[PDB]
Design a protein around this ligand. Structure first.
Ligand code: JTM
Ligand SMILES: *[C@@H]1O[C@H](CO[C@@H]2O[C@@H](C)[C@@H](O)[C@@H](O)[C@@H]2O)[C@@H](O[C@@H]2O[C@H](CO)[C@@H](O[C@@H]3O[C@H](CO)[C@@H](O)[C@H](O)[C@@H]3O)[C@H](O)[C@H]2NC(C)=O)[C@H](O)[C@H]1NC(C)=O
Ligand SMILES: *[C@@H]1O[C@H](CO)[C@@H](O[C@@H]2O[C@H](CO)[C@@H](O)[C@H](O)[C@H]2NC(C)=O)[C@H](O)[C@H]1NC(C)=O
Ligand code: NAG
Ligand code: NA
Ligand code: NA
Ligand code: NA
Lengths: 96, 239, 200, 274
């Protein structure tokens, strides 16, 4: 089961532009589908790092995108991968 | 590392089944089938990495491979075509890059077997003129009336094959070039010293191995079935 | 094709040297082998070159390989009759059985033998069994003599063919003619030497 | 001042026809090269990625790799045919290759191979060998790979000579990127942590380079031993992110601060009070 971690590059302040990162790790095979969502909708033109792997041979990849947090809008990262029946979704919690 | 192929030569009809076999007692895992055609290098048909394995080569179409054991690798033409007329070469090897080639198998696929005919063989003895002029004696062997042109002519003195002093025509000539399925003739010379030919304990034999029909091939004509066979002619030396 | 040989064919006279060329686009080029193939026979290995800039020798055969230029030559010194054959160039793309071989189409070499002591003649030979049948043997002519087919299509004539009595170090050309005709008439359509022996 | 140079290759063979090979190259934790399957050439991801190699030396090295990629792809396919039906597609193969640089012309090189995610083969000395735990069927592929003297000679030279030299040049040319200092920025936040009446505080630290860092929760001058450091997580701009959590009692949040020490701050520790 791929681990998914969502976090902002800068301290989040409502209204202010920022970058949102989705770090996907501990998965294999390396065929994976990563989506970053705003209010459940697919954000267009998400940048991906080149896929790499750690000492233990497991894969990781960094997705990131521009975002401006608000009181209302929700942000998430959705991962499809053969090691799961249904896609896994981790919500950005500003507090976490 | 010795590799053997059988048969060494084969005449077949279109639609017939032909099996080319390769044996190798070197305990090589790897075996390879090629065909050689004029104007081309050898081209890979099928290969095998071991018992039960067969792999498509560069030109596999029309051929099935079969690796029943480490030793034997077979090339099967289920429905033979004239385009499969060729010389077929088998090779074996271990994990190293060297492939060790067999001596080759000649295959001719005809449209029809109706005209297949074994040779007449005649041996022509040396002229006394030649003997007294050169102190050498030339025997001539003549194979005639055969179709197709798949023959091996050889010379035998006292039951042992001779190569020294021999030359055979590089190709059979056509007896009726105007006609479609012309029969063939082939000549060979064996030249010895006169004293060798003059020795009456020397037995000379010209042998032609002819490649024709097998046991299983059907035959509907009234003449003898023109099967693969040997025809020879012989003479003894004399003063 | 990825392997090309030059010349396609050539004729040389006994004792002369010749150079055979092989050019390839095969990548990578682990090794290159030269094969000799006599007419109707199998593949005899002459040499295998493996280095970037390699040179080998095996008697009268020597070879070079330049991997940068993707080029090999085979040199035959002092050709003999038995050098008459097809010479085939092969490049292997791996140093192991994972390799594919890439075969050139070959170069045909014909070596014309040196007939030192010619003695042109036309003999009649008689059949072992039925003595009424015969052939005409045109023999012992030098390699400057050509043999043409017959004008009559009932008469048969072979191409010339050279035999080698190895133990006597002696070579002779011959041709055979037969029909159903005499040996005086047999080689009419050929320009044969003036001193040609016709025995009674 | 020890840097490890890692060339990481991932190869997928879905079936007999389809395959792809992608590579990335790391010097420490900075990416120096990328070689996508779609690209004929290797891409520099830094201005100094060619190191101290001349354009001609680089071309020659890249050419060697271009031949390798095509050849590797066909070799695996042929090895699969050789072992059939023992092993079958899909297949993943990973290589980890490079050298670890020590002070004063000392280095170790390595070349480790993983099959379906398990380390099974390395190059060692002058040959390929299986490692402990590896299945026995690999003995035939190893025998075949070890037959190729030409690959062996080339790999020996790549590991023993080329890797250490190249990396030595990389360290010179990329000194200012490798020795960069980027300042951490911290911020605080809180959540309910599946408990009766407990809160979890979170100290976020982001934008720091290099990786070594110290983050502890503190009441005055008393290091809270409950502090839990998370994993180092990357930013897109080649800086690092880290969060340290402290499990506390609601109402008792007052008093707590988050202290952050990092080489880039030059003695001026960051302190955020709740
Ligand atoms: C590694 C440090 C690099 C530091 C410097 C470069 C840094 C710059 C960034 C570069 C980024 C590169 C990204 C890729 C990173 C991963 C690469 C690490 C592995 C490198 C392996 C290098 C292999 C090179 C050789 C090669 O291509 N062999 C290939 C081509 O070999 C032929 O061509 C050569 C032409 O040079 C030689 O022939 C010429 C010759 C003859 C005689 C002599 Cl003396 C010399 C030459 C040779 O003899 C020929 O056979 C050969 O096909 C190899 O087998 C390819 C695969 C090797 C890896 C195998 C891994 C084990 C897998 C086990 C699988 C088991 C599972 C099976 C189901
Ligand atoms: C490259 O360096 C290796 C040794 O270094 C080790 O392997 C490299 C590929 C890297 O991973 C290094 O980080 C690692 O430390 C040389 O290997 C050695 O080669 C010599 C001969 O060339 C071997 O000597 C043999 O010893 C055996 C006894 O076990 C005898 O049977 C032989 O007669 C012979 O004397 C030596 O064992 C081997 N070392 C190891 C550990 O395998 C390699 O030669 C070198 N190559 C070049 C071209 O520089
Ligand atoms: C990965 O790269 C290789 C080489 O660029 C691709 O292989 C080529 O694919 C095309 C068809 O798309 C073939 O016609 C070529 O002959 C192949 N090249 C070689 C050297 O065999 C391969 O398709 C790429 N893989 C993917 C999934 O895109
Ligand atoms: C091979 O694998 C690819 C990707 O998994 C697939 O889309 C393709 O159809 C497969 N090809 C065959 C011949 O099965
Ligand atoms: Na073997
Ligand atoms: Na690659
Ligand atoms: Na291969």
């Amino acid at each position: 089961t791929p681990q998914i971690q969502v976090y902002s590059r800068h301290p989040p302040e409502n209204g202010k532009p920022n970058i949102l990162n989705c770090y996907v790790t501990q998965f294999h095979p390396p065929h994976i589908e990563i989506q970053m969502l705003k209010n459940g909708k697919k954000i267009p033109k998400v940048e991906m790092s080149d896929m790499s792997f750690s000492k233990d041979w497991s894969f990781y990849i960094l997705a990131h995108t521009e975002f401006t947090p608000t009181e209302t809008d929700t942000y998430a990262c959705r991962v499809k991968h053969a090691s799961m029946a249904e896609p896994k979704t981790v919500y950005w919690d500003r507090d976490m | 590392a010795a590799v053997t192929q059988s048969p060494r030569n084969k005449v077949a009809v279109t639609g017939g089944k032909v099996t080319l076999s390769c044996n190798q007692t070197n305990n090589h895992n790897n075996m390879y089938w090629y065909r050689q055609d004029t104007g081309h290098g050898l081209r890979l048909i099928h290969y095998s990495y071991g018992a039960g394995s067969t792999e498509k080569g560069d030109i596999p179409d029309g051929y099935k491979a079969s690796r029943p054991s480490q030793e034997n690798f077979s090339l099967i033409l289920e429905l033979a075509t004239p385009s499969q007329t060729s010389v077929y070469f088998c090779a074996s090897g271990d994990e190293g890059y060297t492939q060790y080639f067999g001596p080759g198998t000649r295959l001719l696929v005809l449209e029809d077997l109706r005209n297949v005919t074994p040779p007449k063989v005649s041996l022509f003895e040396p002229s006394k003129a030649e003997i007294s002029h050169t102190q050498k004696a030339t025997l001539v062997c003549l194979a005639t009336g055969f179709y197709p042109d798949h023959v091996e002519l050889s010379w035998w003195v006292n039951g042992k094959e001779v190569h020294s002093g021999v030359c055979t025509d590089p190709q059979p000539l056509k007896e009726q070039p105007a006609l479609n399925d012309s029969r063939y003739s082939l000549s060979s010379r064996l030249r010895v010293s006169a004293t060798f030919w003059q020795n009456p304990r020397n037995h000379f034999r010209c042998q032609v191995q002819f490649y024709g029909l097998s046991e299983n091939d059907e035959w509907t004509q009234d003449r003898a079935k023109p099967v693969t066979q040997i025809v020879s002619a012989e003479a003894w030396g004399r003063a | 094709t990825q392997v090309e040989q030059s010349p396609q064919s050539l004729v040389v006279r006994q004792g002369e040297n010749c150079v055979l060329q092989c050019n390839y686009s095969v990548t990578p080029d682990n090794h290159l082998r030269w094969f000799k193939q006599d007419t109707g026979k199998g593949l005899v290995s002459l040499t295998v070159l493996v280095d970037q800039k390699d040179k080998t020798s095996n008697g009268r055969y020597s070879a070079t390989l330049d991997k940068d230029a993707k080029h090999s030559t085979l040199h035959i010194t002092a050709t003999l009759l038995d050098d008459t054959a097809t010479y085939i160039c092969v490049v292997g793309d791996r140093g192991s059985a994972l390799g594919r071989l890439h075969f050139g189409a070959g170069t045909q070499l014909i070596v014309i033998p040196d007939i030192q002591n010619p003695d042109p003649a036309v003999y009649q030979l008689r059949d072992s069994k039925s003595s009424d049948k015969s052939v005409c043997l045109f023999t012992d002519f030098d390699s400057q003599t050509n043999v043409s087919q017959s004008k009559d299509s009932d008469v048969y004539i072979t191409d010339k063919c050279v035999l080698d009595m190895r133990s006597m170090d002696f070579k002779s050309n011959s041709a055979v003619a037969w029909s159903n005709f005499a040996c005086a008439n047999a080689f009419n359509n050929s320009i044969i030497p003036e001193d040609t022996f016709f025995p009674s | 001042k020890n840097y490890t140079f890692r060339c990481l290759q991932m190869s997928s063979f879905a079936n007999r026809s389809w395959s792809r090979t992608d590579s990335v190259v790391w010097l420490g934790d900075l990416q120096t090269h990328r070689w996508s399957n779609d690209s004929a050439t290797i891409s520099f991801t830094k201005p100094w990625s060619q190191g101290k190699l001349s354009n001609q030396q680089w071309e020659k090295l890249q050419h060697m790799f271009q031949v390798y990629r095509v050849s590797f792809t066909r070799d695996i396919q042929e090895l699969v045919k050789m072992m059939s039906p023992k092993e079958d597609y899909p297949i993943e193969i990973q290589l980890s290759a490079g050298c670890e640089m020590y002070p004063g012309n000392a280095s170790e090189s390595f070349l480790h191979v993983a099959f379906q995610g398990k380390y099974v083969v390395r190059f060692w000395g002058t040959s390929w060998q299986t490692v402990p735990g590896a299945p026995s069927w690999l003995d035939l592929p190893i025998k075949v790979l070890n037959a190729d003297q030409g690959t062996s000679a080339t790999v020996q030279m790549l590991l023993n000579d080329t890797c250490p030299l190249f990396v030595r040049g990389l360290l010179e040319a990329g000194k200012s990127d490798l020795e960069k200092q980027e300042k951490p920025v911290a911020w605080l936040s809180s959540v309910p942590s599946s408990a009766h009446g407990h809160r979890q505080l979170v100290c976020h630290v982001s934008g720091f380079y290099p990786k070594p860092v110290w983050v502890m929760w503190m009441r005055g001058d008393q290091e809270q031993q409950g502090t839990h450091r998370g994993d180092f997580l990357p930013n897109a701009d080649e800086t690092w992110y880290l969060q340290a959590t402290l499990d506390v009692e609601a109402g008792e949040e007052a008093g707590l601060a988050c202290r952050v020490k990092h080489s880039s701050l030059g003695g001026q520790d960051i302190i955020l009070y709740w």
